[PDB]
Amino acid sequence: SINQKLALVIKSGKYTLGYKSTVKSLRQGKSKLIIIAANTPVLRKSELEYYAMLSKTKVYYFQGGNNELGTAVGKLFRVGVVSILEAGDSDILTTLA
Amino acid sequence: AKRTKKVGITGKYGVRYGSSLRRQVKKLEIQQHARYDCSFCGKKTVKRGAAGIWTCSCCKKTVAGGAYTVSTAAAATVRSTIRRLREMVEA
Amino acid sequence: AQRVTFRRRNPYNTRSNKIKVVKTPGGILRAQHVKKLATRPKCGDCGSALQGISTLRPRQYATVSKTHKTVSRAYGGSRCANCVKERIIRAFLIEEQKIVKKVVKEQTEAAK
Amino acid sequence: AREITDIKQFLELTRRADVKTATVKINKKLNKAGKPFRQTKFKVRGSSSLYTLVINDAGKAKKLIQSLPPTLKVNRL
Amino acid sequence: GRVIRNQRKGAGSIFTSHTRLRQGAAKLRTLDYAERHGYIRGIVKQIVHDSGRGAPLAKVVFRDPYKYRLREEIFIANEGVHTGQFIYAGKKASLNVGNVLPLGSVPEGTIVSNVEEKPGDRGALARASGNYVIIIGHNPDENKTRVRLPSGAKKVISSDARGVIGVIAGGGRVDKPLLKAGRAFHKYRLKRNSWPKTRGVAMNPVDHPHGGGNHQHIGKASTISRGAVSGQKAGLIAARRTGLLRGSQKTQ
Amino acid sequence: AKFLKAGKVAVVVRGRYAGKKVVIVKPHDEGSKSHPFGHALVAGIERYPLKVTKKHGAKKVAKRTKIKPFIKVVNYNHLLPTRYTLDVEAFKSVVSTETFEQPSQREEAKKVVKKAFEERHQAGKNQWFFSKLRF
RNA sequence: GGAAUCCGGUUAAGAUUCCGGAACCUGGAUAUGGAUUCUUCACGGUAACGUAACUGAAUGUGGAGACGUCGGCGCGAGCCCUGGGAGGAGUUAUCUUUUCUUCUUAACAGCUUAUCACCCCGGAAUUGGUUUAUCCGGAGAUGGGGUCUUAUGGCUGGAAG
RNA sequence: GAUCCGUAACUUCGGGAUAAGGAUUGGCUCUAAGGGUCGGGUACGAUCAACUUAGAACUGGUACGGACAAGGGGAAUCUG
């Protein structure tokens, strides 16, 4: 599943949660992938897709809200976008994700 | 501690009004004074302001809804009817 | 323990008839009539009070200079630097999407 | 109803062609712990406001009343 | 006898509506060219409580097609709408909750509210809280639409009459008991003047057809004909049955 | 990739130039003993040239198309980077860190950007840059 | 709802109205200085935003006017209570460093001053902050640094005359 | 009045309930508990200011909510 793939990047890769750290990693060219929650505001989702196309980064959309995106990264708070800085030994880069 | 056995919120009415009338009030005053999940920001902040008006604290979006709960049982199936009827148009 | 009177012929405790008791240089108490308090100006989008704007009763905004009623930005004393900020994000991205929406229909009319 | 703090800005005030009059008010005060000293107040009356210049150094006060114009109706105390 | 109370109801002295705090007449947009040829998009700016009414109201601002200005209309808030939503009013608009469409452009079974009777009267039917009509069928020639009103009474209306998809918010309101004479007081305080309506059987023979006697009783039949006279219509006017309704009233 | 480069066009979202389009002249991706964050040196357009038609005469076509520029150090977070690109070599040398700190150099560097930006807008290269963003 | 006035004194009887001093508003003409300008219509700050100014008609948008009731909490003002000291009056067979009393500072103006709110840096589970009342934080907390509202208070001018 | 004890049937479980029913209460002299602010390189002490509660001794013509102020209570029936 996609949630199995994210669970390895939290435990064996590098990442940033939240919006202001994500668009920072877009500006540095350090992002590999961004996963946006479903219930993000459309304007925030529109610039995160615009920051990706300026960096040729792939955008994945999570199938759920910010409460259940923060669950898949294994945290008790709610995250709106998770930005994969480094695929570890996981395979989110090489899959449809 | 547990302060009252069964009257709950309706213990403010005391001994008056008839017990079956204070039971139907307790079914709805729990619902209208509860906090509901916001659809938009995903926070549990939505409180009623007036009958049919449900405002969220942060992101400040005000959604119209039922008089004592956010989504009534009638209007939920309405939204899925019009969902069904619309996809018979685009297909 | 010096009791006090109103100074005008309205003897009722209305909104326009507020009293603060002050000590005069004659050593006596005298009431002075206080005007009703100014509200802050609110933002046209979010409704929050917007900062850098002086809070005066509405006709007193004609006695003060321009820099008490404005900030130095587009939408100065009208919007609140965060509704202005999302206004520029929203104006840029939709009008850029409209550039996409032009040419994405120019492939459908070229391939039908 | 307005204090002037620059002594040379006070001197350009006296020739502003509406200031017909002024006054020099002397107050017996103490210099913050002990002994008394002489503070003087130079009040000029403009056409819409009264300007005040407080002078604590009583020597510098003496060099200022000679610096007043000869036309000003100076009211000592 | 004297003039009885429901005859004084129509002279409109103290029996008019207490209409200070009302936000305005809740109305659809007028049928201009955009509403009947394509669509137009407004923004719902505020969902607001209107006094005297159980349903919330929605200020929806639109762009004036012929002048550079903005036009605010005051819709009745259908259940589900939120401030900031884009509302699409017109013929060729989409079947979403909140969009007001003509009835000819919706499929059979669509649940709409605030539906017009004549095309252009800006909203007449299914307009109190919780209510809705059901479009049950089309007659495309002589173009008409059979709908079912909230009272269950079926009605054929024009296919160009408009209506907003969804049911009207604030529903389930009357399931809560008032419990108090104070809540009924404050309920009717912002509507009219008919809260404390003393039973006509406790009045005197001047004041009512029911008054008098050494017991409190009506004395004659309380079902009064339709062809009766103003002043006699006290009781159940033109009642075709009385007593407790046992069985399926619930008209087919 | 690092798209904040020395030719990229950005849109300021914060502070007296909000909505005014800039071009990054020198990206400083991290730090300083001055401004301690990722900041870019931008040259911008403060008063856009107004629209000009066939009706405008010879001394109105000049008056309509003046350009008031500005130069600015701005945070990366206060920039919205665009896809657009503008040539920068005409004022690469003049705009630097030494340009600020001594405001006497600021006005002598603002003239070069005005001469450069007006030279684009006449024979109108870069049409998106010299139009006021509408918000 | 609303443009803008305070103190002191005066009468046999008037006073926020008269008198002395000191302000503010509205409408109107207007002269000089300051500001802006050879990049014509100001610059500074990353930003919140700053300021002695810093053109802007038609039309449009927005804010103020403009708002319930109750409860507890915080803050201010006045009053009450109290200490020393500088005056006056009372008690005093005996006692009482005692009993009473004066010790005041207006409108307006300059500088400074706050809860809330916002900005920058940073990126938090071992969850943290925090209210009398449990709400807030990856939609960016705690923290460090700042910006504003000036109710309000302090100082100075008014003003000790 | 206040403080402490003790409270029934019945109940719509919220009440009834100050149920009913008892004890204490002054003055004086003490005891104990409840606080504020200051200096610790990257365990405490100085000092200041409160009326609240509990207890002990003594004392008196057994008095003490000493004037003022300030519920009579219960078992039921009809009725709203």
Curated annotation (Swiss-Prot), chain A:
Keyword field: Cytoplasm, Isopeptide bond, Ribonucleoprotein, Ribosomal protein, Ubl conjugation
InterPro entries xrefs: Ribosomal_eL30-like, Ribosomal_eL30-like_sf, Ribosomal_eL30_CS, Ribosomal_eL8/eL30/eS12/Gad45
Cross-link (Glycyl lysine isopeptide (Lys-Gly) (interchain with G-Cter in ubiquitin)): 14, 45, 75
Subunit annotation: Component of the large ribosomal subunit (LSU). Mature yeast ribosomes consist of a small (40S) and a large (60S) subunit. The 40S small subunit contains 1 molecule of ribosomal RNA (18S rRNA) and 33 different proteins (encoded by 57 genes). The large 60S subunit contains 3 rRNA molecules (25S, 5.8S and 5S rRNA) and 46 different proteins (encoded by 81 genes).
Function: Component of the ribosome, a large ribonucleoprotein complex responsible for the synthesis of proteins in the cell. The small ribosomal subunit (SSU) binds messenger RNAs (mRNAs) and translates the encoded message by selecting cognate aminoacyl-transfer RNA (tRNA) molecules. The large subunit (LSU) contains the ribosomal catalytic site termed the peptidyl transferase center (PTC), which catalyzes the formation of peptide bonds, thereby polymerizing the amino acids delivered by tRNAs into a polypeptide chain.
Similarity remark: Belongs to the eukaryotic ribosomal protein eL30 family.
Protein name per UniProt: Large ribosomal subunit protein eL30
Gene assigned in the entry: RPL30
Curated annotation (Swiss-Prot), chain B:
Assigned keywords, A-Z: Cytoplasm, Metal-binding, Phosphoprotein, Ribonucleoprotein, Ribosomal protein, Zinc, Zinc-finger
One Pfam short name: Ribosomal_L37ae
GO cellular component, one term: cytosol
Gene Ontology biological-process annotations: cytoplasmic translation
Compartments where located: Cytoplasm
Residues recorded as bearing Phosphoserine in the entry: 39
Zn-finger region bounds: C4-type: 38-59
Gene Ontology terms for molecular function: structural constituent of ribosome; zinc ion binding
Primary location group: cytoplasm
InterPro entries reported in the protein's UniProt record: Ribosomal_eL37/eL43 (IPR011331), Ribosomal_eL43 (IPR002674), Ribosomal_protein_eL43 (IPR050522), Ribosomal_zn-bd (IPR011332)
HAMAP family per the UniProt record, alphabetical: Ribosomal_eL43 (MF_00327)
Membership in a protein family: Belongs to the eukaryotic ribosomal protein eL43 family.
Quaternary state and interactors: Component of the large ribosomal subunit (LSU). Mature yeast ribosomes consist of a small (40S) and a large (60S) subunit. The 40S small subunit contains 1 molecule of ribosomal RNA (18S rRNA) and 33 different proteins (encoded by 57 genes). The large 60S subunit contains 3 rRNA molecules (25S, 5.8S and 5S rRNA) and 46 different proteins (encoded by 81 genes).
Miscellaneous note of the record: Present with 44600 molecules/cell in log phase SD medium.
Protein name: Large ribosomal subunit protein eL43A
Source species: Saccharomyces cerevisiae (strain ATCC 204508 / S288c) (Baker's yeast)
Gene giving rise to this polypeptide: RPL43A
Swiss-Prot record, chain D:
Top-level lineage group: Eukaryota
Cystine connections: none
Localisation per UniProt entry: Cytoplasm
Ribonucleoprotein among keywords: yes
InterPro entries linked to this entry: Ribosomal_eL38, Ribosomal_eL38_sf
GO biological process, one term: protein-RNA complex assembly
GO cellular component, one term: cytosolic large ribosomal subunit
Family matches, as Pfam families: Ribosomal_L38e
Keyword vocabulary terms for this entry: Cytoplasm, Ribonucleoprotein, Ribosomal protein
A single MF term (Gene Ontology): structural constituent of ribosome
Similarity remark: Belongs to the eukaryotic ribosomal protein eL38 family.
Miscellaneous information on this protein: Present with 50200 molecules/cell in log phase SD medium.
Subunit architecture: Component of the large ribosomal subunit (LSU). Mature yeast ribosomes consist of a small (40S) and a large (60S) subunit. The 40S small subunit contains 1 molecule of ribosomal RNA (18S rRNA) and 33 different proteins (encoded by 57 genes). The large 60S subunit contains 3 rRNA molecules (25S, 5.8S and 5S rRNA) and 46 different proteins (encoded by 81 genes).
Function: Component of the ribosome, a large ribonucleoprotein complex responsible for the synthesis of proteins in the cell. The small ribosomal subunit (SSU) binds messenger RNAs (mRNAs) and translates the encoded message by selecting cognate aminoacyl-transfer RNA (tRNA) molecules. The large subunit (LSU) contains the ribosomal catalytic site termed the peptidyl transferase center (PTC), which catalyzes the formation of peptide bonds, thereby polymerizing the amino acids delivered by tRNAs into a polypeptide chain.
Name of this chain's protein: Large ribosomal subunit protein eL38
Gene that encodes it: RPL38
From Swiss-Prot, chain F:
Xref: Gene3D superfamilies: 2.30.30.770
Task of the protein: Component of the ribosome, a large ribonucleoprotein complex responsible for the synthesis of proteins in the cell. The small ribosomal subunit (SSU) binds messenger RNAs (mRNAs) and translates the encoded message by selecting cognate aminoacyl-transfer RNA (tRNA) molecules. The large subunit (LSU) contains the ribosomal catalytic site termed the peptidyl transferase center (PTC), which catalyzes the formation of peptide bonds, thereby polymerizing the amino acids delivered by tRNAs into a polypeptide chain.
Biological processes, Gene Ontology terms: cytoplasmic translation
Other notes: Present with 7380 molecules/cell in log phase SD medium. There are 2 genes for eL27 in yeast.
Similarity comment: family membership: Belongs to the eukaryotic ribosomal protein eL27 family.
Lineage, top ranks: Eukaryota, Fungi, Dikarya, Ascomycota, Saccharomycotina
InterPro entries attached to this UniProt entry: Ribosomal_eL27 (IPR001141), Ribosomal_eL27_CS (IPR018262), Ribosomal_eL27_KOW (IPR041991), Ribosomal_eL27_sf (IPR038655), Translation_prot_SH3-like_sf (IPR008991)
Keywords: Cytoplasm, Ribonucleoprotein, Ribosomal protein
Protein name: Large ribosomal subunit protein eL27A
Gene name linked to the record: RPL27A
Species this chain originates from: Saccharomyces cerevisiae (strain ATCC 204508 / S288c) (Baker's yeast)
